[PDB]
């Protein structure tokens, strides 16, 4: 059976109601790198709502932000 070789990094999201807003911070520490993805919602566009708007928007800036990383490790490398 051939390898399967398993890791698991976390991602921690903080959530601030403040004003009738919502602001997500997405933080993913991995090795030696940290990188952040900030999204922000109406609370009320129900309040679970908002924070799920809001993190969704993070989550898509982290990824975001992260291909572009990627992209500038690997080029780093190939030149
Ligand atoms: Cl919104």
Redesign the pocket.
């Given at each position: 059976q051939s390898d399967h070789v398993l890791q698991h990094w976390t991602v921690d999201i903080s959530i601030d109601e403040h004003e009738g807003l919502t602001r997500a911070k997405a933080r993913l520490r991995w090795r030696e790198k940290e990188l952040v993805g900030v999204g922000?919602?109406?609370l009320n566009?129900v309040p679970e709502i908002?924070d799920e708007?809001?993190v969704a928007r993070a989550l898509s800036d982290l990824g975001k932000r992260m291909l572009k990383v990627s992209t500038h490790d690997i080029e780093a490398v190939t030149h």
């Open positions: 922000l919602a109406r566009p908002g708007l809001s």
